[PDB]
Amino acid sequence: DKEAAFDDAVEERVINEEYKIWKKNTPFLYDLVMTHALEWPSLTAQWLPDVTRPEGKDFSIHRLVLGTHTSDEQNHLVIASVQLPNDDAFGSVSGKIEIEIKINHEGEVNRARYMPQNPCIIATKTPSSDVLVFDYTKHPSKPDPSGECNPDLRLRGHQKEGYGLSWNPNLSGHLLSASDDHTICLWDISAVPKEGKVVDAKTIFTGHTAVVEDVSWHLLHESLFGSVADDQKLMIWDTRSNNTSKPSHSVDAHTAEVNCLSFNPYSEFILATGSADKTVALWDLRNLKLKLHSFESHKDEIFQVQWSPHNETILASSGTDRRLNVWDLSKIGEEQSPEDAEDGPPELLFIHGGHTAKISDFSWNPNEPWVICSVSEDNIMQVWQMAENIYN
Amino acid sequence: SLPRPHDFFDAQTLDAIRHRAICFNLSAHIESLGKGHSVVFHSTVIAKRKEKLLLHWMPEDILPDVWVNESERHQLKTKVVHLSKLPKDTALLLDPNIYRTMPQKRLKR
Amino acid sequence: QADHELFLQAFEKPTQIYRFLRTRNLIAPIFLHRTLTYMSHRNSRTNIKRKTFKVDDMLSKVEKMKGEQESHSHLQLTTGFFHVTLEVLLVKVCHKKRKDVSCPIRQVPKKQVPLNPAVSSNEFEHMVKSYSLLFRVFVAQMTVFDKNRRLQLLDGEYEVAMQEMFSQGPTLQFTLRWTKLRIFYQFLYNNNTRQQTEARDDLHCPWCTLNCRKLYSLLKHLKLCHSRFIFNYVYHPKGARIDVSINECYDGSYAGNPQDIHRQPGFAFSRNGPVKRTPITHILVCRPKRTKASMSEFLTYSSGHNRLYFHSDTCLPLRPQEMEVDSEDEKDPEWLREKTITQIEEFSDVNEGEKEVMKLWNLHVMKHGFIADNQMNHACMLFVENYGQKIIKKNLCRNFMLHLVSMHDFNLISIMSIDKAVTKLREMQQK
Amino acid sequence: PPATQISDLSKRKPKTEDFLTFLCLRGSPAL
């Protein structure tokens, strides 16, 4: 409709003005705020664990595993280096978010989850039904102007596109992926024969009627992992159950489509699930039926929830609302002043509004306390750190 | 001096915003009766609970109808509620551009 | 006068923008104002983040489940209408899924009411957000449960009024049962038209209606959030006089992809699919000092391409795809070639074949850009490598030999070069 | 009491039927 187009234009103007206002207040809201406009939009982001601290230099170098989203050109699996001001003081050090590696990739990258037991191996989700387990060390630094070279591994167990990609921390390898075919397939990988061409699914899970939006492994037990789907039913699957159809737990957990999921790094029972109901709800694995506090301040879908690795009571959510909200779980229920109540719930700690488009993905840097890299569909990557005064 | 950066709002968006503001001030009385930060809704009795009274406020599809006694109805025939406390589910109806998903489109996830 | 009208418009544009932003942010905030350092007056609660999150389940179970109170608990319905059979249908409005634009409503249901003189099942049970009953005679809708499942539709006499297509209009009766700191603003435009006001609510943002409890916080909020103006504090004998003027510069152009700033309508700000753009890196906050608050305050770095470029020839926007190549400035512009051809052909004292060979040589030299005498030698060979067929077809081989002789007489080339060039020309004819 | 800032802003953004009259309908322009 023409009215819809006029409203979209007005909203674009308002979004630009809001971004300008936010950037005016960026010094008073963040300690570090670095915005980089990637050549191609990225649908994924995950800091590599390795960090380099050059002696005599005021900064440090971290590695980001970014994807690519080309309209028709050759998609890539970008790996870039980011310079962070470390503890004290940089003014001008030339390139700060320059790329390091670029491996050719058939189709846009949907996920860039590296293998934790070996950050050399990085997996990727293609628009096709097959997942590719790259190895950026083996591949050439510069991209070969040809087709998608042999990724050293290509697992095909799905029937359509997928978005979930979970790496087992307790077991080396074990990349489990959930696709739109209502199937969450698990590939053993790792202990597999060399000369990687095709890797069949070790076990495929069909217990979610709708399209499984995402899936994550349990951070303590190697036999447990949660899967969340569009049927509004977050399921916690237990391996070695002699059945690949009935999950151990089948809590509905939401009303609208539930997209993301992330276990608490510290607690062995706390997990968060963001959904299309504009609600990020915490959960306890001790009792499945009962629901914990439901963080409700988003105005659109919650596409990604990720607990902070440096804190046990901090969780961040983002999605189509174009806002990145940081929640302090230990602040839930605290009495607030009327101005504080007007600003937002006591649980909510910070709202990042530097993105003019939907946040495709975000991640924390394990080597830094409170810095987050969030990539939007506007081909914008922002590495930002919340101001110290917010969290003492 | 420095060149004029060609302000992005222009006049068409300004005209639409002026129209929306005029409608908002005529409907919710935000400027006059809302003290600049609240919506002044006027309730209307619809049904009588003979066991309270059900009242519906003038800006429709914003706040649910509630049951109030006759004395309560007389006391609160008009309700002023701050924008912060508006129900998040239906608060967006106060203006088309209060929050609009810019990429409506299709495909994506 | 027209000066006041111009002032009113020039202040109304940013005032209207900021008033809309005020009405929008209170429901859709750009950021939490309590998280702004200059707005530290709010967020009146310290950090007690020293309690484990593994006992939240027990705390919530004890608080809610242990002390659970029943929210509520068939329905009995029956009097007459006023101003005819009417239909009573139970409407169940479902939750708004991503696929659905609006919340779906499924109407699961007649009685012969008097012309202006029912026992319901356990259909309630939760995909449906709430349960409502709709009456049509002349329509009437009433909800039985709220968002929190609040027990509405109280049992007893109910004179539920109806809206055409209690009250004076057509109403229906039914029986329901079970089973100081004065702050002054002096708006100034062109230093000639001034409007002096005074804030109705002290220490409150006139635009955003925000409660800045301190004068420094209010001034900083004005300078930052409402940046379309410039706020020059001047102090007042009674309170504070905040002069307000329109920010002359206010670089507030489009901040997205520079390509969209020049696309044709219908494709600008399309957001439909991924769009390539030139890489750029910006650093806004690196490590701010975080100095103490003081009123004395009221007495950036970028790497990469940070604009939209244009073609030097057509003055049209330059796409990122057409950037890494096509420097678009090469040795021999087409206009120079045409001018050389015209100047050669415009001579009076020259033969036709002589002019043709002269133009061919000039075009070849421009296309290759010889500047060195020794290269001239190889240049001659290059000529027969590119213009040999054309000269042969034009049958100007003798003129080419004459040109070679003249060039040798002008130094550069040599007798051996002349013989080699002629032999290369002959091999073309034999082929 | 030279008017009020909120009243001046409300006399600035709307200038039509929904102007609430009051002092805005009075000699607001040209002081």
From Swiss-Prot, chain A:
There is a cross-link at K2 (Glycyl lysine isopeptide (Lys-Gly) (interchain with G-Cter in ubiquitin)). Changing E377A: Decreased interaction with ZNF827. There is a cross-link at K2, K142 (Glycyl lysine isopeptide (Lys-Gly) (interchain with G-Cter in SUMO2)). Residues 1-114 are annotated as: Interaction with ARMC12. The modification Phosphoserine is found at S92, S337. Binds directly to helix 1 of the histone fold of histone H4, a region that is not accessible when H4 is in chromatin. Subunit of the chromatin assembly factor 1 (CAF-1) complex, which is composed of RBBP4, CHAF1B and CHAF1A. Subunit of the core histone deacetylase (HDAC) complex, which is composed of HDAC1, HDAC2, RBBP4 and RBBP7. The core HDAC complex associates with SIN3A, ARID4B/SAP180, SAP18, SAP30, SAP130, SUDS3/SAP45 and possibly ARID4A/RBP1 and ING1 to form the SIN3 HDAC complex. This is Histone-binding protein RBBP4.
From Swiss-Prot, chain B:
The modification Phosphoserine is found at S1. Residues 18-84 are annotated as: Interaction with SUZ12. It comes from the Eukaryota. It is found in: Nucleus. Acts as an accessory subunit for the core Polycomb repressive complex 2 (PRC2), which mediates histone H3K27 (H3K27me3) trimethylation on chromatin leading to transcriptional repression of the affected target gene. Plays a role in nucleosome localization of the PRC2 complex. Belongs to the AEBP2/jing C2H2-type zinc-finger family. Self-associates. Associates with the PRC2 complex, which consists of the core components EED, EZH1 or EZH2, SUZ12, and RBBP4, and various combinations of accessory subunits including AEBP2, JARID2, PHF19, MTF2 and EPOP. Found in a monomeric PRC2.2 (class 2) complex consisting of at least SUZ12, RBBP4, AEBP2 and JARID2. Within the PRC2 complex, interacts directly with SUZ12; competes with PHF19 for SUZ12 binding. Interacts with EED, EZH2, and RBBP4. May also interact with RBBP7. This is Zinc finger protein AEBP2. It comes from Homo sapiens. The chain holds residues 390 to 503 of 517 of the full protein.
Swiss-Prot record, chain C:
Changing F11A: Fails to interact with JARID2. The keyword Transmembrane does not apply. Changing R290Q: In IMMAS; uncertain significance. Under hypoxic conditions, the precursor SUZ12 RNA undergoes regulated trans-splicing with the JAZF1 RNA, resulting in a chimeric isoform which may be protective against apoptosis. The chimeric transcript is characterized by JAZF1 exons 1-3 joined to SUZ12 exon 2-16. The chimeric transcript is expressed primarily in the endometrium from late secretory and early proliferative phases of the menstrual cycle, but not in normal myometrium at any phase of the cycle. Its expression is slightly induced by low levels of progesterone, but suppressed by both estrogen and high levels of progesterone. The gene is SUZ12. This is Polycomb protein SUZ12. Overexpressed in breast and colon cancer. The modification Phosphoserine is found at S296, S327. Transmembrane segments: none annotated. One of its GO terms (molecular function) is zinc ion binding. Its main location: nucleus. It is found in: Nucleus. Belongs to the VEFS (VRN2-EMF2-FIS2-SU(Z)12) family.
